[PDB]
């Protein structure tokens, strides 16, 4: 019984491997061996934001390129204005162990969650001058590690019980569940058309999910340890993954396999966050040896360094018009570079 | 500057004035993490110090006008190499062990080895509670189960000269107690570096002094931390 199923798995695995190998007729490095490089890239610190009492663990820009939300493990979400550094909102939470935050694409809500297995929604523009909790979404059986809005009435969450879910806010019930990972799910990324998404687990694996029918379309392997961050290429046909073995990689969807590996011979730390430039030429990445690195995404050569944090870098994000970069670390400070 | 800019600046000033108070309250409260296994009696210690669905529970007690918070994690899976990283800035970890269970003692030892040696938990002290002393006395005096069936080296062990067998107990109980204590103190001293220590205590299920012991140990931890600046 088990022998037949194991044999079936082995045969299908071998066939899929051979089918992928039959279509590998060139490598990205060779075809991109004739491009003039980008030279040295040097960036400067224009703002520094002070005010948290403990480490910072997440951050997210708005669709206006001007306002930020950030969150600390002392019980505070803070909404910042970056052109001047004025503070706009400071929201005290109920549980002080919080691991993620997100900002709505219209400017009217924020969300957060953590070791208590609940996602809480906060409504900003109310009839009074305050912010009031509107909803508490409960039903996961492990901590929340990421969440992203689709509109003002749907949200997607990933948790440490090895699942993902899609929630209807006005009702408070799960509209669909995405099961199939084996370890803890650690990150999400939404497609530009918001009809698919991708996720990566505490298992050297990533998966492509279709929202409408709740099925898994493809599986991608290649890393050697757990995956910590993920994001899409600007046109929506490739993505990049950073893992806990000192390596980023770039995968492509249509060809169904790996394209490039970004690694160095003197780097032996882990990776905490990744993101892309607006045209897709640069890839930024944050490490836990206190630093961030800027790579050339088409030739795989290091081009720059961001340095100036006294503790492990944890979050990192790039605006919707490409003007600025924001970093946050475990020493309680946010920095804006340009 | 127009009226809008001045109004924004005053709003930011109010937020700052509140954050100062929150800072003063936060800086004067101690935070503790409670760890153990299901057969350890961890809950009895919790309920005893409670006289001073969800994924985490909290217990608040106060001694001599100092406030302690104690955090206990429930309703999570049994893989813990990711959420444990959230606890790298507490004051102390409290580790509870059932000392009468010979079968599941090497697992407790392995847990201690992992907690002692992590990269993000290298500067945090441990308070160790070797629970259930009376059950250990009954088991040893019964004479039908032998410790050496799991640890051979007990056959070559003698009682230390700093023992304090105050209430006139049987000598065999004293040998057993101090052997089991030394098993954890070996791991404690093998790979420390002067950055964190371990404080062992014998205890049972009818004690009334665990809060005072935590008070004194936390006091000493803070004093060493202050002194370390003069090196």
């Amino acid at each position, epitope marked *: 019984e088990l022998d037949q199923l194991r044999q079936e798995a082995e045969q299908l695995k071998n066939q899929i491997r051979d089918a992928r190998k039959a279509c590998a007729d060139a490598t990205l490095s060779q075809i991109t061996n004739n491009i003039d490089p980008v030279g040295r890239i040097q960036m400067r610190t224009r703002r520094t934001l002070r005010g948290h009492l403990a480490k910072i663990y997440a951050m997210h820009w708005g669709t206006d390129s001007r306002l930020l939300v950030s969150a600390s493990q002392d019980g505070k979400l803070i909404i910042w204005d970056s052109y001047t550094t004025n503070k706009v909102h400071a929201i005290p939470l109920r549980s002080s162990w919080v691991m993620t935050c997100a900002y709505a694409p219209s400017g009217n809500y924020v969300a957060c969650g953590g070791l208590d297995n609940i996602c809480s929604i906060y409504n900003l523009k109310t009839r009074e001058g305050n912010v009031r909790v509107s909803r508490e979404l409960a039903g996961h059986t492990g901590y929340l590690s990421c969440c992203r809005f689709l509109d003002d009435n749907q949200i997607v969450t990933s948790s440490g019980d090895t699942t993902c879910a899609l929630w209807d806010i006005e009702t408070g019930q799960q509209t669909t569940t995405f099961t199939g990972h084996t370890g803890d799910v650690m990150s999400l990324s939404l497609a530009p058309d918001t009809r698919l998404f991708v996720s990566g687990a505490c298992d*050297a694996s990533a998966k492509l999910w279709d929202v409408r029918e709740g099925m898994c379309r493809q599986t991608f392997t290649g890393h050697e340890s757990d995956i910590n961050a993920i994001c899409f290429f600007p046109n929506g046909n490739a993505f990049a993954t950073g893992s806990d073995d000192a390596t980023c990689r770039l995968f492509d969807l249509r060809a169904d396999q790996e394209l490039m590996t970004y690694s160095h011979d003197n780097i*032996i730390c882990g990776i905490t966050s990744v993101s892309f430039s607006k045209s897709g030429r640069l890839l930024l990445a944050g490490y836990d040896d206190f630093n961030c690195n800027v790579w050339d995404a088409l030739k795989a050569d290091r081009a720059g360094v961001l340095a100036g944090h006294d503790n492990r870098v944890s979050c990192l994000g790039v605006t919707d018009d490409g003007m600025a970069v924001a970093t946050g670390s475990w020493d309680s400070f946010l920095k804006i570079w340009n | 500057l127009s009226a809008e800019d001045k109004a924004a600046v005053e709003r930011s000033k109010m937020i700052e004035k509140q954050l100062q108070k929150d800072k003063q309250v936060y800086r004067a409260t101690h935070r503790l993490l409670l760890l153990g296994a299901d057969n350890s009696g961890k809950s009895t210690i919790v309920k005893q110090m409670r006289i001073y669905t969800s994924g985490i529970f909290e217990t608040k007690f106060q001694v001599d006008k100092v406030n302690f918070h104690m955090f206990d994690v429930g309703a999570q899976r049994d893989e813990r*190499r990711k959420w444990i990283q959230c606890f790298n800035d507490v004051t102390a970890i409290i580790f509870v062990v059932d000392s009468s269970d010979y079968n599941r003692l090497q697992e407790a030892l392995n847990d201690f080895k*992992s907690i002692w040696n992590n990269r993000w938990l290298r500067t945090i002290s441990v308070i160790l509670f070797l629970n259930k002393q009376d059950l250990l006395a009954e088991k040893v005096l019964a004479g039908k189960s032998k410790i050496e069936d*799991y640890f051979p080296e007990f056959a070559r062990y003698t009682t230390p000269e700093d023992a304090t067998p105050e209430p006139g107990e049987d000598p065999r109980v004293t040998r057993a107690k101090y052997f089991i204590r030394d098993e954890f103190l070996r791991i404690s001293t093998a790979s420390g570096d002067g950055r964190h220590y371990c404080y062992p205590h014998f205890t049972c299920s009818v004690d009334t002094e665990n809060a005072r012991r935590i008070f004194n140990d936390c006091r000493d931890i803070i004093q060493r931390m202050h002194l370390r600046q003069y090196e």
Partner: nanobody, 127 residues
Framework: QVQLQESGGGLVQPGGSLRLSCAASGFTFSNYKMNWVRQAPGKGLEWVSDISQSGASISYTGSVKGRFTISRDNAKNTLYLQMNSLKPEDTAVYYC?????????????????????RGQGTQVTVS
């Protein structure tokens, strides 16, 4: 694609011996610390022995101390366990496990129920 495959189990009489071996694939072998665990009919998972990256540090559990030996080969990418004088309490299903991250002294989560970097195991019977 991480892969670990154990081989060498079987059925022996008391006082006999055998030798288990894991063949590994999909990662740099000599970056990681390796372990042997086991499960017996009616209990949970129990840690048996441990070896480091170079072969210079070795550790055992109490009940097997003078009898089992652990060793590794970084050229063929393989682990060996030698079991010498066996008792009817040694019958079990044996598994081969890898530490989660490289270049590390600790080892979280090797005995848990569902672990990603563990093999399929082999059956050993003493009778």
């Amino acid at each position: 694609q991480v892969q670990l495959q154990e081989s060498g189990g079987g059925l022996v009489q008391p006082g006999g011996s055998l030798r288990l071996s894991c063949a590994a694939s999909g990662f740099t072998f000599s970056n990681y610390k390796m372990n042997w665990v086991r499960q017996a009919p009616g209990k949970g998972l129990e840690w048996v022995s441990d070896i480091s990256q170079s072969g210079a540090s070795i550790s055992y559990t109490g009940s097997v101390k003078g009898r089992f030996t652990i060793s590794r080969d970084n050229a063929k990418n393989t682990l060996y366990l030698q079991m010498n004088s066996l008792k009817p309490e040694d019958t079990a299903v044996y598994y081969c496990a890898r530490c989660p991250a490289p270049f590390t002294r600790d080892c979280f989560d090797v005995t848990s129920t569902t672990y990603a970097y563990r093999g399929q195991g082999t059956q050993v019977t003493v009778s």
